[PDB]
């Protein structure tokens, strides 16, 4: 086509989606990770995660308002990844890298798994 | 903070949101523009438009599944802008620029209004 493109559009959309999340506006699911709960938008979760894409395209699970993750999933690891989904920013630290990588593998977030593997290999 | 950032994340999220829209997955509103209907996600509309941000933060309108636009709004103009919302790509042409600009003004999409004004000024 002969379209023009607004460079910052995708980033501005994501910034607004994060603002809606912070104010709990039109959030439609709560992700339970052991004792912790995280409110989010199903569409954003599906757009970032192979696991959530699978869950919310399921004819029964698409209608659930609560999703319980595997008890082995670390809440801090999940929190860091949920923030990444809504911001493109990953708070990767020596103290959390193992939990972040295991959570990214479970959530099926290939690019996060890739940078975790690379940061781990550099430290060995 | 000490975060790392994935450059393509925002664009990949938007590409997936557009894929969900095309397959009518978790769309939660229909925008009626005279004889035409457009299915979309409320969160994406709010993230792109001052008008939709106002509508869906309203305590009554947030729960509506159908929103009827002003009868003066051109469906093709709306279609071009809805595509822009989900892709960052604006199909701006001599034959549609007036309708696109009027629709962008109504929807409160300042950057689109700005490029329309500039393209119009260049042709006078």
């Amino acid at each position: 086509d002969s379209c023009i493109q607004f460079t910052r559009h995708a980033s501005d959309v994501l910034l607004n989606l994060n603002r809606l999340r912070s104010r709990d506006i039109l959030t439609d699911v709560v992700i339970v990770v052991s004792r912790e709960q995280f409110r989010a938008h199903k569409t954003v979760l599906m757009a970032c995660s192979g696991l959530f894409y699978s869950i919310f395209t399921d004819q029964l699970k698409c209608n659930l308002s609560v999703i319980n993750l595997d008890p082995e999933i670390n809440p801090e690891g999940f929190c860091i990844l949920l923030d990444f989904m809504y911001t493109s920013r990953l708070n990767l630290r020596e103290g959390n890298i193992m939990a972040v990588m295991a959570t990214a593998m479970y959530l099926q977030m290939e690019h996060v798994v890739d940078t975790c593997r690379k940061f781990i290999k550099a430290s060995e | 903070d000490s975060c790392i950032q994935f450059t393509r994340h925002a664009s990949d999220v938007l590409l997936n949101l557009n894929r969900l829209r095309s397959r009518d997955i978790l769309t939660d509103v229909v925008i009626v523009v005279s004889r035409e209907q457009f299915r979309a996600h409320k969160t994406v509309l709010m993230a792109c438009s001052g008008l939709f941000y106002s509508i869906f933060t309203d305590q009554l309108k947030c729960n509506l599944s159908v929103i009827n636009l002003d009868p003066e709004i051109n469906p093709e103009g709306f279609c071009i802008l809805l595509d822009f919302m989900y892709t960052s790509r604006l199909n701006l042409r001599e034959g549609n620029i007036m309708a696109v600009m009027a629709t962008a003004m109504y929807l409160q999409m300042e950057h689109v209004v700005d490029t329309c004004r500039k393209f119009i000024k260049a042709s006078e």
Partner: peptide, 4 residues
């Protein structure tokens, strides 16, 4: 705005 750019030509993509």
């Amino acid at each position: 705005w750019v030509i993509p």
